[PDB]
Amino acid sequence: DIKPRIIRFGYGLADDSPTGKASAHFAEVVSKLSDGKMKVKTFGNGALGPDEQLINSLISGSGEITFVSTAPIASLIPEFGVFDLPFLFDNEKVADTVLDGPEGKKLLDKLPAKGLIGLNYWENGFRNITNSRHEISKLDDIGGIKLRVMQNQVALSVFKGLGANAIPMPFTELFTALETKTVDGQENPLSTIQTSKFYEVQPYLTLSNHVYTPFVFLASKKWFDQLSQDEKDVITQAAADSQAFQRKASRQGNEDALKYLKEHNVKVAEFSTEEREKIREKVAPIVESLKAKIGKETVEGVLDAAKKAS
Numbered sequence: 001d002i003k004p005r006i007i008r009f010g011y012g013l014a015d016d017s018p019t020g021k022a023s024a025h026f027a028e029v030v031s032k033l034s035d036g037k038m039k040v041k042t043f044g045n046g047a048l049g050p051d052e053q054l055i056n057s058l059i060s061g062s063g064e065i066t067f068v069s070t071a072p073i074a075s076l077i078p079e080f081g082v083f084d085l086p087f088l089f090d091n092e093k094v095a096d097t098v099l100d101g102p103e104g105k106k107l108l109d110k111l112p113a114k115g116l117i118g119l120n121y122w123e124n125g126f127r128n129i130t131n132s133r134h135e136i137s138k139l140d141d142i143g144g145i146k147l148r149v150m151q152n153q154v155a156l157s158v159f160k161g162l163g164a165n166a167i168p169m170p171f172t173e174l175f176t177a178l179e180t181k182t183v184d185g186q187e188n189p190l191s192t193i194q195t196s197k198f199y200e201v202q203p204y205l206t207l208s209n210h211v212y213t214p215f216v217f218l219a220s221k222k223w224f225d226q227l228s229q230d231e232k233d234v235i236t237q238a239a240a241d242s243q244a245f246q247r248k249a250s251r252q253g254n255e256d257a258l259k260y261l262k263e264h265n266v267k268v269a270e271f272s273t274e275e276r277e278k279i280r281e282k283v284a285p286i287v288e289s290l291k292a293k294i295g296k297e298t299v300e301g302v303l304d305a306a307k308k309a310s
């Protein structure tokens with residue numbers, strides 16, 4: 001029971017990012033599983049707007065499928081802010097274990113009430129600080145930096161406690177903000193730094209890996225519910241395959257990104273063994289202050305899951 005169907009899949013990253021390629025993989029998988037009846041049209045690079053507009057398009061039904069960072073989802077479901085706390089996941093395997101396990105499910109289960117289906121989690125990744133003002137090799141270097149952040153109370157409060165002037169901004173507006181110095185810096189994974197070409201206008205990169213951002217692979221509930229069971233299985237089986245392809249392409253992509261930015265002679269700094277610890281004491285209090293705004297059971301469950309996984 002599968003009827004011809006055209007399915008729109010907008011997103012914010014460049015088409016040749018690892019996640020942009022995974023979207024094409026998902027379109028390919030949906031077509032094979034549907035005998036080419038279900039055709040997914042991708043609109044990369046912010047064509048259908050930023051994460052916030054993509055969320056609302058799925059809510060209203062003008063859009064069918066997307067992937068977005070968790071941070072904008074906090075504007076609907078505050079618990080999703082948990083992922084903007086620095087240093088929750090030691091590595092990608094902890095991240096996979098937790099997001100794919102009970103605590104990640106609890107959060108995805110909160111989506112249908114707001115009109116969304118959380119198909120599964122994809123990888124955005126560990127985020128790194130880029131700027132055009134001066135090298136950032138110490139916590140004190142953040143002081144007063146004009147840093148764009150994702151549009152969330154958690155993100156804003158984290159970086160302001162680290163001493164930056166935190167400017168919430170949609171991703172789709174970032175490249176211009178960087179090039180014109182309306183903001184000094186930004187924070188994203190290396191493969192995004194590369195494929196959005198932020199390095200072109202950010203002479204300084206700091207390998208800080210301070211926050212891990214999951215993507216949520218989203219479907220419009222309104223649209224998904226009108227599908228056949230056969231049509232739903234196409235989406236959910238495609239989602240499962242593309243997740244594995246996704247995570248693999250993202251992590252190869254972060255490796256290739258590192259090679260590229262280094263061989264391109266970006267000025268790459270790092271946080272000293274200590275400066276990293278200097279960072280942790282600074283946040284611990286505001287992290288503690290932010291639990292009330294995320295959900296204590298969420299924060300503590302995620303931290304407990306993260307502790308068992310490692």
Ligand SMILES: C[C@H](O)[C@H](O)[C@H](O)[C@@H](O)C(=O)O
Binds near residue numbers: 012050069124171187
């Ligand atoms: C819209 C993207 O697909 C993603 O949400 C974004 O790059 C995120 O890392 C951010 O910096 O806002």
